Design a protein around this ligand. Structure first.
Ligand code: 07L
Length: 126
């Protein structure tokens, strides 16, 4: 159902959380090779997480679940902000700008957190 599809999206979000936390540690340690690999893995997880969210949103629209659609519209707007900042962080790493990278790392943590109270609401709505 849409709810098992939501359990998969939740699991991918958690896989990104885990990889992001190992990537931040590697950045702090100066292990640039490792960071470059984690960033590739995160970019993929964004691609897969987005695909699941798109499929959840479309099923809610077709099902007429107005409250789920509202909440999913809001969350995917937050998620998109995350994507834009993630691209900025990748571009900072490419450029060798650790100052900007550190900042973007902090910003992305706030986007994830600011969307969590919505993520919990959607499930109760689906
Ligand atoms: O799919 C995601 C969700 C959150 C997230 C947060 C940080 C990141 O680097 C990648 C991420 O991918």
């Amino acid at each position: 159902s849409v709810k098992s599809e939501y359990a998969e999206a939740a699991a991918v979000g958690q896989e990104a959380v885990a990889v992001f936390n190992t990537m931040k540690a590697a950045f702090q340690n100066g292990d640039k090779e490792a960071v470059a690999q984690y960033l590739a893995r995160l970019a993929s997880l964004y691609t897969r997480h987005e695909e699941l969210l798109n499929r959840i949103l479309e099923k809610a629209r077709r099902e007429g679940n107005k409250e789920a659609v509202t909440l999913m519209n809001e969350f995917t707007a937050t998620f998109q902000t995350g994507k834009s900042i993630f691209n900025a962080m990748v571009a900072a790493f490419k450029n060798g700008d650790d100052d900007s990278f550190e900042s973007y790392l902090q910003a992305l943590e706030k986007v994830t957190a600011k969307g969590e109270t919505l993520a919990d609401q959607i499930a109760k709505a689906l």
